[PDB]
Amino acid sequence: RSGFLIPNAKYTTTNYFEFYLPYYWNIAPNMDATITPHYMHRRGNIMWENEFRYLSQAGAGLMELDYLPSDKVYEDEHPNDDSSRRWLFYWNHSGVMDQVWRFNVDYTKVSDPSYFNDFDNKYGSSTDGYATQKFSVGYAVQNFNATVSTKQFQVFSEQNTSSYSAEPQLDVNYYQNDVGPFDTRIYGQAVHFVNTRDDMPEATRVHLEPTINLPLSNNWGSINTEAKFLATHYQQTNLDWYNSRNTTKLDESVNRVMPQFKVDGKMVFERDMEMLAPGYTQTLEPRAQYLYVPYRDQSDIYNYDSSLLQSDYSGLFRDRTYGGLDRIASANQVTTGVTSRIYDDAAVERFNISVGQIYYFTESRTGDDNITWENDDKTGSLVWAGDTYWRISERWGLRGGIQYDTRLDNVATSNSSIEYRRDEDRLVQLNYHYASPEYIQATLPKYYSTAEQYKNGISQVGAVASRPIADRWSIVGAYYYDTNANKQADSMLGVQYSSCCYAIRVGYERKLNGWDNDKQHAVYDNAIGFNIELGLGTQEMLRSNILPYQNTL
């Protein structure tokens, strides 16, 4: 049951003619391996790909090791390096042992940051901006969970290679409900941030937060009161270099305690919809929330893992403006929203629409506010969000989502998509993605607003189609077009003939691959290849490009 597979062939503008010679190995019932010579003509060598799948009591795991001993192109374009060898190490592991132990591994290592722009995208993508290196061992019982985690990142951009990593990390949760009318939670964390660069601050953070809530519910109403008590302690070292240049002095040791008060309420109204559709019911769902958190000055704390969050309809009701625990903006706000739903005679939801806003009584200031807003509004109804999902029929369906910000004075982000999908073999979809240039200037780094490839923003229209022919073929296509530059971003074609035993496949894709800054334009890549194997396979063909298809229903 061990032997060579049928060879796979491909032609790419980056690689010229490629050839695969895979060999399967059935080591055991729970383990198997694959050794693939990958001959590349432009590089003129053989990259060895080693693939290993295993199933154990700990969980399921995949490992991949690609090694190219020498490189002509990298040697030409890096003539001064010691060696031109290229390599990739990937390890994925997910397992739950004995119902309580959780093991997670997601490790990727590359020799150089230009690896994924030049090689196959089996366990990576050219769109990836970095490689993730995560280990996690946790113990979780029904009212408790602890997790020791290590997170590291390999940043591919050469503009600035300085990424923080929390090498030790300890997450502890303790839940205890029905303590009288109240429910109780406690969250603990201990994290050590270390940076790749030797002249940047290194931190140890200890966080504790109790939380007590009173839920109250009826058939129509719900009121939830919550009181949370955050306490964080920072030990910062190796901060001479930062203090040598900045005016805001990072402190050696800091500690900060904040009370947070939250009130959530929601109602449900129902009516019969006999005027339009007899037997259908319409539900109107108001929701309100009040959040209070006093202002603390975080100027002397470096921002390690705090970033701005999206404000979708559901994101209007979050209690946090930044992720992580470095930046916690003071809040004195009330948020309101309405959700309308329609149910048919079978009590199946067919349509829902949501709209909401966030009213700030006082400005949400964190002491290190450097976001470049378009204008200077600080209070009032500042953020608006809206969502919709209409199921027109069993084979039709559209979703939409829009976000408006007055501080940007513009629609920050919106998206939409309509799908016709009679089945996985045959379907059509059109989607649109937008992200305004003001939002990119406000949230992304400073150099994004000046770079040509980033300053414009995002505006793409995508179309995906799939249609079988004579129930042996399966024609698949996709096209994505950026209207700001009026340029193609990604397109592909796929034709597969599935026989009783063998299935032949031919695929083409042209995608954005990089940015040539010598001339200030984009560099594309073409790839036409055929593979043979021993359904009509539309779904994996739809997933073969850099902008994979997603079911919208």
Binding site: D251, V254, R256, P259, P294, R296, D300, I301
Partner: peptide, 17 residues
Amino acid sequence: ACKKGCDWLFLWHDDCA
């Protein structure tokens, strides 16, 4: 980060003062 006349009994106010 701590102010001059901050108090540890005044958490609910801004800057504990």
